[PDB]
Write an enzyme that holds these catalytic residues in place. Structure first.
Site, PDB file in Angstrom:
ATOM      1  N   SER A   1      84.748  -6.340  58.553  1.00 34.15           N
ATOM      2  CA  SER A   1      84.001  -6.720  59.735  1.00 34.15           C
ATOM      3  C   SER A   1      84.896  -7.544  60.647  1.00 34.15           C
ATOM      4  CB  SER A   1      82.748  -7.500  59.325  1.00 34.15           C
ATOM      5  OG  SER A   1      82.121  -8.112  60.439  1.00 34.15           O
TER       6      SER A   1
ATOM      7  N   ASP B   1      72.438   3.038  44.784  1.00 35.21           N
ATOM      8  CA  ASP B   1      73.341   1.896  44.761  1.00 35.21           C
ATOM      9  C   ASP B   1      74.752   2.302  45.199  1.00 35.21           C
ATOM     10  OD1 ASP B   1      74.710  -0.422  44.248  1.00 35.21           O
ATOM     11  OD2 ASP B   1      74.617  -0.241  42.048  1.00 35.21           O
TER      12      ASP B   1
END
EC number: 3.4.23.22
Length: 330
Positions: free
Chosen positions: A199, A35
């Site tokens: 992004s 994770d």
């Protein structure tokens, strides 16, 4: 040193991925959920409340000659989906794919939430976010990667998750045969303890690319792709019959649909998520309503590039003094 381990979806939907981890001496092999969105290595154990164990493999520290109780230490964590676990702490030898750390904090669960009990395939989590998020008290502990870093050939790990197929986590090296073209690297903020990046935009299907900054985290421990409501609405508007359902808890779509791809920007580069990756199947057995793999982050408080996004790429988690993220197509 280096390590290389195969990671395998837990089910037919890629709801999560498990990777075998050797703990203790002799080795006790547990299948952990790696994770990048948390920083605790915790396991089902011989100390876990018996009613809360249902098929998981447990770590038994008393059978390990290298286990030592970390006196006074406790831990307690809550995840984004509201699941939780807590317990005490041992140090022990931990190996992943041939890479060994001595003195790793292994957090032994005394209590786990129902969600964990009900998933027989996950024996614990291995956190790969930054050690500043580790929950051990009163002495915070380091992640497996943080402990291994100085010994690694290069201070990196890579995630290569498969779509309905096994993939790989590598530690200490970049497998140049595992991706196509070049790796595009992008800046990371560690201010919240995550692999947080921005992004450069998105496209839906064969549509035009929208240049827009989307800050979010690269999180292998989250199944879906969580993005701003505007982006998610633009995606599902291209699927006839798709709708956000309050009762189901997100966007659903007719199982008869062909889903469009979704593209996200990494610098000037583009990662394409095929439409099939966005199908999470019937909302309930036999239903013709299917759950979408792109969902709104509104009310989460952060955008999350989870497995739906990451499995479309070869992803480098670069843990150099100034960390960065790299993405390649594959």
């Amino acid at each position: 040193s280096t390590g290389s381990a195969t990671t395998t979806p837990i089910d037919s939907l890629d709801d999560a991925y498990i990777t075998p981890v050797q703990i203790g001496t002799p080795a006790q092999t547990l299948n952990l959920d790696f994770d990048t969105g948390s920083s605790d290595l915790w396991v089902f154990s011989s100390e876990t409340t018996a009613s809360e164990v249902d098929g998981q493999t447990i770590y038994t520290p008393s059978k390990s000659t290298t286990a030592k109780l970390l006196s006074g230490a406790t831990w307690s964590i809550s995840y984004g989906d509201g699941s939780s676990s807590s317990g005490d702490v041992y140090t022990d030898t931990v190996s992943v794919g041939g890479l060994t750390v001595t003195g790793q904090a292994v957090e032994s669960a005394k209590k786990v939430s129902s969600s964990f009990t009900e998933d027989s395939t996950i024996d614990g989590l291995l956190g790969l976010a930054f050690s500043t998020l580790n929950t051990v008290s009163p002495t915070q502990q380091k992640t497996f990667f943080d402990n291994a870093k100085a010994s690694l050939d290069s201070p990196v790990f890579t995630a290569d998750l498969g779509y309905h197929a096994p993939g790989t986590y590598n530690f200490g090296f970049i497998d140049t045969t595992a991706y196509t073209g070049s790796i595009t690297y992008t800046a990371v903020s560690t201010k919240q303890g995550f692999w947080e990046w921005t992004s450069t935009g998105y496209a839906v299907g064969s549509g035009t690319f929208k240049s827009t900054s989307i800050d979010g985290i690269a999180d292998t421990g989250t199944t879906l792709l969580y993005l701003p409501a505007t982006v998610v609405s633009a995606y599902w508007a291209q699927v006839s019959g798709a709708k956000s359902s309050s009762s189901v808890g997100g966007y659903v779509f007719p199982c008869s649909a062909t889903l469009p791809s979704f593209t996200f920007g990494v610098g000037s580069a583009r990662i394409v998520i095929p439409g099939d990756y966005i199908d999470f199947g019937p909302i309930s057995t036999g239903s013709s309503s299917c759950f979408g793999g792109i969902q709104s982050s509104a009310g989460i408080g952060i955008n999350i590039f989870g497995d739906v996004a990451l499995k479309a790429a070869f992803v480098v988690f670069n843990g150099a003094t100034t960390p960065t993220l790299g993405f390649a197509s594959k």
